[PDB]
Design a protein around this ligand. Structure first.
Ligand SMILES: COC(=O)COc1cccc(COC(=O)c2cn[nH]c2)c1
Ligand SMILES: COC(=O)COc1cccc(COC(=O)c2cn[nH]c2)c1
Lengths: 212, 213
């Protein structure tokens, strides 16, 4: 049973996952995903969420006063506050497993140059805060990363949704001049396992030598 | 100018392309295609059990082949998100940012029949890529990540970044580091350099050539 709150200036972006949820898991009270528009907590008529960085430079920084108010309302001491950022600790499958047993995740989607650092610093004095990167590239905002995180975590929550894996094949046995490797149709399951292991080894060497 | 086609059995999940990415400026067109449009069955069965055994289902090559025949040309870069792919990094995003035509094929279940990629590679460039070391249910979220990463680099649109600050200079008894308020560019550049190095060592030692925790 997990509650996920997402805070973003683009709430419509998160509507796919809101619809990716089986009705059964919602009605069983296994999962709830709520999305909140950050501008609800702006306090000027122009609904400002960012401002120029101290120390100069191009880019805008999201205002601590706005985020502070939002997190104050949404978070509790039990919350795991997740902040996607290219400067974060690596988000991996191990991370997803760990977070899959959390009761309350709040994902704070930043944009532009990022969120004023005091927001996370302040939050960290009364809840668990995790700045995480989903990969070594740069996006415009945290929303796509939030989708990845939500999907990776929730698919590990029962009933809600190393080497590289080798190739897989299904019907038909012959297609556009290409046959399924005959070993897979051999009925020798020890030999099939060894073939797949070697395929995995070769693919890992070729594509991800870092994993060795 | 760039064209992006995404092919998926869940085209509704790709609606978030029309939010912060834009298209509206006409520098790029993005189209989403329902893979089931290329089935001939009354049940539209896109998957079956894997040869050689194993859990789950594999997407049949027949439906993908027909779809890609219609959508791709020899100039197409066929992108296939997969946890078993080459790593997609910022370098990749730069490389793809000058392409005319990306087609992103989103898999589901336990994957796509290997022959789809093998067949496509006889006529176009194919890139199987991972966006990170975690497992998703399907390629669609990875497609969105790839699209975002690439589009912000399209003409007409290391270390970890350290902390950023903005007004007010004091908040909840927390002050902006005084050097940032000082207007001294050399001292500010140096402080920021030191913060980034400190953050990179702590969070991503691998980037500086050290063992990971
Ligand atoms: C204190 O927290 C923050 O400042 C975070 O704010 C930002 C700043 C820049 C970019 C993003 C979006 O996340 C990614 O691009 C990302 C995640 N993983 N890999 C790339 C978010
Ligand atoms: C030949 O290509 C395929 O078989 C594609 O198959 C699948 C199957 C399930 C899920 C996905 C989506 O990719 C990721 O989860 C992913 C990407 N990066 N890191 C994780 C793709």
């Amino acid at each position: 049973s997990m509650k996920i709150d997402v805070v973003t200036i683009f709430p419509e972006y998160l509507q796919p996952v809101r619809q990716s949820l089986p009705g059964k898991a919602i009605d069983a009270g296994l999962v709830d995903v709520a999305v909140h528009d950050l501008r609800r907590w702006t306090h000027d008529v122009h609904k400002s969420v960012d401002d120029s960085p101290y120390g100069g430079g191009p880019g805008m920084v999201m205002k601590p006063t706005v985020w502070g108010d939002a997190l104050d309302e949404i978070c509790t001491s039990e919350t795991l506050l997740v902040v996607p950022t290219p400067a974060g600790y690596p988000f991996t499958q191990e991370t997803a497993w760990q977070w899959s047993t959390e009761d309350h995740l709040v994902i704070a989607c930043g944009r532009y140059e990022g969120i004023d650092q005091r927001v996370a610093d302040d939050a960290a004095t009364r809840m668990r805060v995790r700045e995480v990167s989903i990969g070594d590239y740069v996006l415009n905002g945290g929303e796509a990363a939030a989708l990845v995180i939500i999907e990776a975590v929730l698919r590990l929550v029962p009933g809600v949704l190393s080497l590289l894996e080798g190739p897989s094949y299904t019907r038909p046995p012959s297609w556009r001049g290409m046959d399924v490797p005959p070993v897979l149709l051999s009925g020798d399951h020890a030999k099939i396992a060894a073939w797949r292991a070697e395929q995995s080894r070769q693919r890992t060497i070729e594509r991800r030598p870092d994993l060795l």
